[PDB]
């Protein structure tokens, strides 16, 4: 009665995984600064996205099982590794440093944050030796028992971030090969999982800034309206909670020092850049955030939190309960200088369901860093001449509720940045990759004559 | 009257050379053993090979011109070199050693086989000498004229094998690409070359262990119902003769010493493992093979050796001719320690053409090896903790005839490991790679419609 | 009335740019000797090229915008750098050299050309040192404040030239990939730009020797029956002028000294080759060119220069103004040693349009070279023992104009090798690569059957 007919090219897809390839705007070429996330091999992006909107279709998404974030995690590390493959491997610097405190003009709080170190080195000629000095932060030198040594020397040698390549993030687009498509969930209420009433296929994702941060997401994508709380399992106490502000709050971080870069010649053709001296007064690094906006912003976060825990509980915010400096402070880089800001001045409040001082958050700067939770890998950031200042956009917020007493009288939330790939999950949660299945069959009344 | 007609997909093949790719089982993949042969990158194989039998077809075979052997050799070498790249190079070990004989607990025969050596090294800080000592075998040190030096210093620096990776052989399957095929010769009597009445094609070869040995094939395949002898030209004297047993001969090897590994910290993040003190007495290593099951094995071999040499010749066996240690002594590794055994006790007998004593073969251990007859590349196997004992099958044997001055009076056979391909040749002798030729033309009584 | 019909495989092409691959003869690879331009991996060339001559077709050939030169310039650098990767780094050689003048048997001209240097050098063992001596050319040393040092020490270290790889150029063929084509211009008066009535297609270009030189094109391709002048814009002065002799002039370059190579063993697994002493007396290097055949060549060149500058102006030749040795003198590497010949004795003449002295050109040898006018890379060609004699053709000449004082009566031309890619631009001026477009549509009277 019915005969099978084969149709080729029908619009059917299926979830799967592939290897998305890079794509970025050609404006990066004009920079000619050899960005660490090399755009030279990235295919140029299209002049304008072609956002095809699909009518009357629903698809299932899961931002936490998304493979795009996992693939990006590997790519960012791989791009970073390839950059520090041709740069000075600061092996010779493991020598007995003879350091002393600096007390030229020092504030009481900044008593011993940095030291004045002197050590021997080798001129371009092996036979000759030269005595040089440099200023090392107290977080990069440890004592023997005034013998001092670098923290890296008993773990691994640190490469020395080339002084040309730049750490400034630039937008990138992760685009699928032919035979695969990316679906964007335009739904304004899609939290973490479920059928999106509106799904639109796109050529590939928009610009994604690879901004690495802890306890706070900077320069991110804001929600169109309302604040959103994202998590796989709200009840679980050992699960991170992601937030997204509908409006941004600016934070101004500055290093008011006047460090002067000094060049030290070690070996033939290899130079080690170290801080020479300090010009003018010495003041501790800090970040300024307006209390008026933050308290208003924090009030919105509490409003949505009460939805999943009842509209009578007492929501309390507390600082991190422990860990090393990397996980217990807000970490980021601002124009090639890495900050570690004590963020305990923000998460201290209580809500019982009922001027422009610009709150200051003291910060510290580190030169020997890992920033991938890896042992045996390291990098040394040379100093930056003159003062440095930058302004950011605090859009996201990572929190981890902890504790339990069999009583819902109050819930306490603390910042948490254990998972360093959650920065990008907050941007790729709207995307999923599918593979098309053009072949298909369907019975009909057509019969092949011959 | 007939007309040319074309066919596509006909079963026709021609001999060809291609690049077979690896394939290994995933059962042990999750163990994270990190073998020297990167089986993690090998595509998982099918649960069972697709043994397809081809009837009424005879295929020529040549185990000596087969390219599967030559390709395998370069894969093993490439894998071995690829695994030594990340390990630490022991370049700073070339120092004037000051060694003395050890006589704490020594037997008469093992008088000066190892030395107590002391040498000054530099610590993580590159301006402080640290005096350390280690135990070195007599084969890894030479005199200057009281003071010794490592034998490899005047050839090249050596990279020690990382303890994380293991030298345990594991099966690997070589599977050809699409459009090619592999033919298995199922004939039982197929000696070295010629038509194979029973030919079958498989998805790809069975697991082959990359075992490296000399004069004795361990953990190899067994020829059933007979003991086989392979040789491209039996008459030619300078052609290694390969013997494949039908029942394995067990061999037990042990190192009674109980040395304790000692770690020495050199440079940043790099550690060199010394030998450390010896617990208990020191005894020479040895290998045991039962004479009851070995003497009768020779009788089987002699019976087949007479077919190609006459039924009245006198068969004689003598030890190796002599020369370099690696070629004149049975060598292997079990437990990660390389042995070099003296097999003079096995090949010493004569036949006139007509009590588990457990023969013990003394063996010596070497820490500096090349293993590929290569100059400029060396490896340093770190010492293992505790006693090591291994049990293996002798499923094969190699011989090299000598003499021939008399017309036909007697024959003398000696072992020989001159070529390194014989170990894998005995496993790949059943396989041949061919390429398919789907196109074909045959006349028939047919015409085009227009 | 008409219907469009599609034709597949039509003869139509378009200008395009691709990545050509290599093709070399078997003789170079058959020797089994290693070459800097490793043609062993390069695929074998066809037995003969099939130069199909097209008819009635004209193409707009261009040599100044051709990408073949740009691709080949980068390709040559890559192979040259690749061959130096496994060689030995001479970084233990940066020490305070203590040199003195040598006056064993010195010619009047070659007084301070080379110096006798001694220094402290390392040894296989870390705790032992050796004192060695060598003769270094004056161009390779500089006073530290007597105490000298290698010039490259204060820029970058010098990777030694491996002693087996030879710089002997060998012809190579560039073959376009499938789907592309190469067009050859058979016109015998093609001036580099404009329509070429005689066009042909070749699957591979002729063998091009990668000869690197300055001010003179050696071992090139000769024109027939006339001398041709190539230039982007004759009026412009910043643009170089290319000449191509129809007949060659033979130049004999010799190094009369009889240097003796000496091997100094530094560190484990690496050796440094140095120059011991000069058997016999020491004489300056030079090159011989006959006066009779060179005056005629300039007579042909000046005749053609009059077409583009009038038939009454005075044509003058002057030596190079100034600059670095790599640009103000003729350079070449024949016999494995790098020369820098002072060609001021050739370009000194004045023509107003109205015996075998064998001109001798003094040359200075150098051992620390940076061939790819890069900055940072260095190479050290080891000395070659024995007297070396060299014979070469001169089949080209690069010239530059100085300017005009509003009077065309006198015009002076000087040699110049500023850009390294003009050498290969003289061999690829007849070639261009095009893309094959087989799809085409034309109207005919053909209705679809159904």
């Amino acid at each position, epitope marked *: 009665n019915l005969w099978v007919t084969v149709y080729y090219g029908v619009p059917v897809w299926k979830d799967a995984e592939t290897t998305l390839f890079c794509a970025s705007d050609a404006k990066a070429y004009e920079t000619e600064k050899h960005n660490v996330w090399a755009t030279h091999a990235c295919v140029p992006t299209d002049p304008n996205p072609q956002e095809i909107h699909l009518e009357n279709v629903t698809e299932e998404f899961n931002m936490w099982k998304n493979n795009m974030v996992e693939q990006m995690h590997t790519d960012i590390i791989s791009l970073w590794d390839q950059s520090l493959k041709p740069c000075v491997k600061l*092996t*010779p610097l*493991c*020598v007995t440093l003879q350091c002393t405190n600096v007390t030229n003009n020092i504030t009481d709080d900044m008593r011993g944050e940095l030291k004045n170190c002197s050590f*021997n*080195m*080798t001129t371009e000629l*092996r036979d000759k*030796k030269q005595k040089v000095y440099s200023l090392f932060y107290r977080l990069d030198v440890v004592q023997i028992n005034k013998e001092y040594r670098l923290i890296n020397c008993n773990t691994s040698a640190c490469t020395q971030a080339c002084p040309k390549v730049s750490f400034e993030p630039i937008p990138i687009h992760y685009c699928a090969p032919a035979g695969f498509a990316i679906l964007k969930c335009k739904d304004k209420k899609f939290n973490g999982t479920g059928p999106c009433p509106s799904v639109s296929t796109v050529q590939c994702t928009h610009g994604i800034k690879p901004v690495v941060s802890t306890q706070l997401l900077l320069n991110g994508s804001l929600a169109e309206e309302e604040v959103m709380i994202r998590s796989e399992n709200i009840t679980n106490n050992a699960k991170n909670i992601l937030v997204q502000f509908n409006t941004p709050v600016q934070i101004n971080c500055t290093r008011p020092n006047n460090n002067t870069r000094k060049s030290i010649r070690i*070996g033939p053709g290899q130079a080690f850049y170290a801080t020479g001296d300090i010009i003018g007064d010495i003041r501790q690094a800090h970040c300024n955030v307006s209390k008026a906006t933050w308290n208003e912003t924090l009030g919105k976060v509490v409003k949505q939190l009460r939805k999943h825990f009842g509209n009578n509980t007492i929501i309390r915010f507390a600082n991190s309960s422990g860990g090393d400096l990397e996980v217990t402070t807000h970490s980021f880089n601002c124009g090639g200088e890495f900050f570690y800001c004590n963020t305990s001045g923000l998460f201290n409040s209580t809500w019982i369901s009922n001027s422009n001082d610009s709150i200051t958050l003291p910060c510290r700067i580190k030169q020997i860093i890992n920033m991938w939770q890896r042992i045996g890998q390291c990098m040394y950031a040379p100093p930056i001449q003159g003062v440095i200042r930058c302004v950011s956009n605090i859009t996201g917020l990572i929190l981890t509720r902890d504790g339990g007493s069999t009583n819902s009288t109050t819930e306490t939330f603390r910042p948490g940045g254990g998972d360093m790939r959650d920065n990008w999950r907050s941007e790729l949660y709207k995307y999923k990759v599918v593979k098309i299945e053009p072949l298909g069959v369907a019975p009909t009344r057509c019969k092949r004559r011959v | 009257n007939l007309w040319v007609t074309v066919y596509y997909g006909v079963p026709v093949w021609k001999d060809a050379e291609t690049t077979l790719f690896c394939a290994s089982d995933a059962k042990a993949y999750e163990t994270e053993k990190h073998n020297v042969w990167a089986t993690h990158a090998c595509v998982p194989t099918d649960p069972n090979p697709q043994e397809i039998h081809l009837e009424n077809v005879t295929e020529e075979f040549n185990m000596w011109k087969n390219n599967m052997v030559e390709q395998m050799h370069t894969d093993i070498i490439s894998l071995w070199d690829q695994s030594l790249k990340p390990c630490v190079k022991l*370049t*700073p070990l070339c*120092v004037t050693l000051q060694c003395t004989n050890v006589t704490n607990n020594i037997t008469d025969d093992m008088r000066g086989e190892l030395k107590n050596c002391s040498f*000054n*090294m*530099t610590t993580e800080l*590159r*301006d*402080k*000498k640290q005096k350390v000592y280690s135990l070195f075998y007599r084969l890894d040190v030479v005199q200057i004229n009281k003071e010794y030096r490592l034998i490899n210093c005047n050839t090249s620096a050596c990279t020690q094998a990382c303890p994380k990776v293991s030298f345990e052989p594991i099966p690997i399957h070589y599977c050809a690409p699409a459009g090619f095929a592999i033919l298995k010769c199922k004939d039982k009597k197929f000696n070295g070359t010629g038509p194979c009445p029973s030919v079958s094609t498989v998805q790809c070869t069975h697991g082959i262990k990359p075992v490296v040995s000399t004069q004795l094939l361990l953990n190899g395949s067994l020829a059933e119902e007979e003991v086989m002898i392979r040789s491209e030209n039996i008459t030619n004297n300078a052609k290694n003769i390969l013997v494949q047993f039908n029942t394995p001969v067990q061999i037990n090897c042990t190192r009674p010493n109980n040395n304790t590994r000692k770690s020495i910290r050199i440079g940043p993040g790099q550690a060199f493992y010394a030998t450390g003190d010896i617990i208990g007495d020191i005894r020479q290593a040895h290998c045991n093979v039962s004479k009851a099951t070995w003497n009768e094995t020779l009788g089987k071999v002699v019976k087949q050796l007479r077919k190609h040499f006459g039924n009245n010749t006198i068969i004689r066996f003598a030890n190796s001719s002599g020369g370099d240690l690696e070629v004149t002594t049975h060598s292997f590794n079990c437990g990660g320690e390389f042995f070099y055994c003296n097999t003079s006790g096995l090949f010493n007998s004569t036949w006139i053409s007509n009590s588990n004593d457990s023969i013990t073969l003394p063996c010596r251990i070497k820490q500096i090896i090349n293993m590929w007859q290569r100059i400029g590349q060396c490896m340093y196997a770190p010492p293992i903790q505790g006693v090591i004992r291994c049990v293996s099958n002798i499923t094969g044997l190699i011989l090299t005839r000598d003499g021939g001055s008399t017309n036909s009076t007697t024959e003398t056979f000696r072992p020989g490991g001159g070529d390194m391909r014989d170990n894998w040749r005995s496993e790949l002798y059943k396989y041949k790679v061919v390429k398919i030729e789907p196109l074909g033309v045959a006349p028939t009584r047919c015409k085009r419609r227009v | 009335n008409l219907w469009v019909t599609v034709y597949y495989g039509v003869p139509v092409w378009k200008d395009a740019e691709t990545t050509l691959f290599c093709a070399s003869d078997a003789k170079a690879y058959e020797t089994e000797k290693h070459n800097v331009w490793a043609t062993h991996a390069c695929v074998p060339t066809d037995p003969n090229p099939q130069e199909i001559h097209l008819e009635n077709v004209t193409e707009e050939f261009n040599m100044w915008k051709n990408n073949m030169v740009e691709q080949m310039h980068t390709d040559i650098i890559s192979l040259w750098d690749q061959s130096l990767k496994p060689c030995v780094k001479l*970084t233990p050689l940066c020490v305070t050299l203590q040199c003195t003048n040598v006056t064993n048997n010195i010619t009047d001209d070659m007084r301070g050309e080379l110096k006798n240097c001694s220094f402290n050098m*390392t040894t296989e063992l*870390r*705790d032992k*040192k050796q004192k060695v001596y060598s003769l270094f050319y004056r161009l390779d040393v500089v006073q530290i404040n007597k105490e000298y040092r290698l010039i490259n020490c204060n820029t970058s270290a010098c990777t030694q030239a491996c002693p087996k790889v030879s710089f002997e150029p060998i012809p190579i063929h560039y073959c376009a990939p499938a789907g592309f084509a190469i067009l050859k211009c058979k016109d015998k008066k093609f001036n580099g730009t404009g329509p070429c009535p005689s066009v042909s297609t070749v699957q591979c270009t002729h063998g091009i020797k990668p000869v690197v030189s300055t001010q003179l094109l050696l071992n090139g391709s000769l024109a027939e029956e006339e001398v041709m002048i190539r230039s982007e814009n004759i009026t412009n002065n910043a643009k170089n002028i290319l000449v191509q002799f129809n007949t060659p002039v033979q130049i004999n370059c010799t190094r009369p000294n009889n240097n003796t190579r000496k091997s100094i063993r530094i560190g484990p697994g690496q050796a440094f080759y140095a120059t011991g002493d000069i058997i016999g007396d020491i004489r300056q290097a030079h090159c011989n060119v006959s006066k009779a055949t060179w005056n005629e060549t300039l007579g042909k060149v000046v005749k053609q220069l009059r077409k583009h500058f009038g038939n009454n102006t005075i044509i003058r030749f002057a030596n190079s103004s100034g600059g670095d040795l790599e640009v103000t003198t003729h350079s070449f590497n024949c016999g494995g040693e790098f020369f820098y010949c002072n060609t001021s004795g050739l370009f000194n003449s004045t023509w107003i349009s109205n015996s075998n002295d064998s001109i001798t050109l003094p040359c200075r040898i150098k051992q620390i070279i940076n061939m790819w006018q890069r900055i940072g890379q260095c190479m050290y060609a080891p000395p070659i023992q024995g007297v070396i004699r060299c014979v070469s053709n001169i089949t080209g000449l690069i010239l530059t104009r100085d300017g005009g004082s509003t009077n065309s009566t006198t015009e002076t031309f000087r040699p110049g090798g500023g850009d390294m890619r003009d050498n290969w631009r003289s061999e690829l001026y007849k070639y261009k690569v095009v893309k094959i477009e087989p799809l085409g549509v034309a109207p005919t009277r053909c209705k679809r059957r159904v």
Partner: antibody
Amino acid sequence: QVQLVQSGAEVKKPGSSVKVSCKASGNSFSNHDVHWVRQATGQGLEWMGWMSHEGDKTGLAQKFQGRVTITRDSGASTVYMELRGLTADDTAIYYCLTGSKHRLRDYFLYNEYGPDYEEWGDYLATLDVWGHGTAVTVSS
Amino acid sequence: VVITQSPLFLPVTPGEAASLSCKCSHSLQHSTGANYLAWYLQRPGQTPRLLIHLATHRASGVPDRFSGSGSGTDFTLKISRVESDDVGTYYCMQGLHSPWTFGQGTKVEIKR
């Protein structure tokens, strides 16, 4: 013949601190080493201390450990010495003199890419011209 | 470290050669290897004057009569035509190993 001057003779009771001064014309301390020696009637000479012309390294005998100090003024204009534990048997005559040293290398391990680990040492070569000296006696 | 010299006394007639030797417990070739020897003449009531250093070279202005030789752990000083002007005590000094100390010394008197 370089003229040299020394402080005049002084007498102090046992178990007390004293100060002495010595100066050299031409600032010869820059390129010469200074040692202190004493002599007693019927007995041989005895060395007390020394200083390197670099001024980096100094040393004394094991018996003088923790009881003798050497100080120099800025610019090497003058130097002063401190004496402790005087005894009636310590009668002798002080002297001012220069010296020379032979600084050689005893050991070296060749670090790959970093500063070498060298063990330097000093060996006294000769005693240069002496001065007229100063006589010091202990009595009570 | 200890140092000894001998003989304590040895009368020498004027115009006759004399030999004196000084040694220390540590061998001159103990660790580094070199002489580092110094010879001084102690004129009574006057400062000592260096004669020869290391027994290998003679200081400028010193008479050529003084000479030295020997090897190993023992060395001797050879002087031709001894004169009463050399009467005094001779002290040997070592610079091989710190601390640096003088020898005990010996006295030579003209026979009378």
